[PDB]
Write an enzyme that holds these catalytic residues in place. Sequence first.
Site, PDB file in Angstrom:
ATOM      1  N   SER A 145      36.501  45.469  31.962  1.00 24.03           N
ATOM      2  CA  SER A 145      36.680  44.619  33.150  1.00 24.03           C
ATOM      3  C   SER A 145      37.599  43.463  32.768  1.00 24.03           C
ATOM      4  O   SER A 145      38.701  43.700  32.252  1.00 24.03           O
ATOM      5  CB  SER A 145      35.335  44.245  33.725  1.00 24.03           C
ATOM      6  OG  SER A 145      34.643  45.377  34.193  1.00 24.03           O
ATOM      7  N   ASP A 249      38.609  52.252  41.124  1.00 24.28           N
ATOM      8  CA  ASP A 249      37.769  51.242  40.505  1.00 24.28           C
ATOM      9  C   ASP A 249      37.123  50.355  41.565  1.00 24.28           C
ATOM     10  O   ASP A 249      37.779  49.898  42.498  1.00 24.28           O
ATOM     11  CB  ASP A 249      38.629  50.393  39.581  1.00 24.28           C
ATOM     12  CG  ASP A 249      37.830  49.389  38.825  1.00 24.28           C
ATOM     13  OD1 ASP A 249      37.296  49.742  37.755  1.00 24.28           O
ATOM     14  OD2 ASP A 249      37.745  48.242  39.315  1.00 24.28           O
ATOM     15  N   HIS A 295      32.932  51.440  37.839  1.00 24.43           N
ATOM     16  CA  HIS A 295      33.498  50.264  37.189  1.00 24.43           C
ATOM     17  C   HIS A 295      32.933  50.179  35.780  1.00 24.43           C
ATOM     18  O   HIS A 295      31.712  50.211  35.607  1.00 24.43           O
ATOM     19  CB  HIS A 295      33.154  48.994  37.978  1.00 24.43           C
ATOM     20  CG  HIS A 295      33.896  47.775  37.521  1.00 24.43           C
ATOM     21  ND1 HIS A 295      35.265  47.752  37.363  1.00 24.43           N
ATOM     22  CD2 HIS A 295      33.459  46.537  37.193  1.00 24.43           C
ATOM     23  CE1 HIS A 295      35.639  46.552  36.956  1.00 24.43           C
ATOM     24  NE2 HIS A 295      34.562  45.795  36.849  1.00 24.43           N
TER      25      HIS A 295
END
Length: 351
Positions: A145, A249, A295
Site C-alpha cells: 500500500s 485495487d 488490496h
Amino acid sequence: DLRLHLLLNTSVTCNDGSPAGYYLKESRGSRRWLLFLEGGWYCFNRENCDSRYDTMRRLMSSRDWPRTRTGTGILSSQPEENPYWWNANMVFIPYCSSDVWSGASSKSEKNEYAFMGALIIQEVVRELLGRGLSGAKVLLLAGSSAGGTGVLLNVDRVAEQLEKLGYPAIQVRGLADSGWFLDNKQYRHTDCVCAPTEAIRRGIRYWNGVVPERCRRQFQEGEEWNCFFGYKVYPTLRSPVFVVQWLFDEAQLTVDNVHLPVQEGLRLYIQNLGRELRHTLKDVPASFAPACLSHEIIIRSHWTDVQVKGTSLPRALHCWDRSLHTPLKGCPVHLVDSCPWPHCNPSCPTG
Ligand SMILES: *[C@@H]1O[C@H](CO)[C@@H](O)[C@H](O)[C@H]1NC(C)=O
C-alpha cells in the site's frame, strides 16, 4: 516473532516526535535481508492529521507499540507459509510518518508534526549494518500500500546510501505491493478535503517530501507529485523492482469514487481501469498482477494461494531471484492477467 528496537537516533521520529523504530528477527546463517514498509494512507494538512492522530495514533506515534509482532506472509519464518524467503533476516518498519515514506521534516516551532519517512528508512538501514546487515548479499526493500509506493520512492536511495557507506556488494532490490496507482479520471465527482494528485501535491509541501533524483529532474519543481505514481517513477529507477498490483485495487477504486447491479457506464469504467493498469505493466519485466478486487498481498497469511497463469507469487519471486543470478523454462517473472473483470481469475481472494 519480530522484536521492537526504537531508533538509537531519537531525532528520527514518528509524527508526534516519539522515536521511530523497527521490528527485527535475525537469521544467523542468512545473508538475505527483507525490510518491509508498512502502509496505511497518509495525511496532508493540520486538520486531517489531527483527525488521524485521534483514531489512527499507532500510525503517528510509537508510544503504544507492542514489544513484538508476529511475522505473516513474506515476513513468516515458516517455509509452509513463506516458501520464498522464510530463512531471511526479517525487518518490519512501522509506518508512523503519514507521508508515503517521503518526508524529511522535523517537528519544530513551525511544524506541529514531523514527517520523516525517508529518514526513518535511512536510519533503520544505518543501525542494522551493525546488527549483521554489513554482511548481507541481498537487501530486499518491500512494502504494501503506501509502503509499496514507499519502495518506489526509496529503493534507489537505499542503494546510494549503502554505496556511500562502503558496502557496494549488497544488492538492493525492491518489491512494491499495492503501491502502483493511476492518476486517472474519477468515475464520479470530487470532494477531497480525494483526487490523490492534489492531496499528494499538498502533502509534499506539508511534509518536505522527497522523490528519487532522476524522477525529480524529469518533472522538476512543483511537479514532483508525478513521482508518486509508479508508472512514471519506475522507468527512472536503477534497482531491480518487482511490482505486485491487483488489477482492480480497492484503494484505486476508492480514490476513483467507485463503491460496488453494475450498469454500462460503471462496467466500462472498471474494464478500462484494468486495461490501463495492464498497459502500464507491459514493460515491467518482474510483475504479478491478478484480475481481482482486493488490496495488499505480501504480508497476508494466505498470500501463497493466488496464481496467475498457474504460478503463485512466492514462485514468481523465486524465479525473479534466479533471473538476477535469458528467460527461465517454467519459471516466469512477468505474470499479468488478461481477463477483464474482477474474479475472472478463480484464485482471487474470497474476502
Ligand atoms: C540523526 O538523524 C539526523 C536526521 O536524519 C541526522 O542529521 C543526524 O546526523 C543523525 N545523528 C546520528 C548520531 O545518527
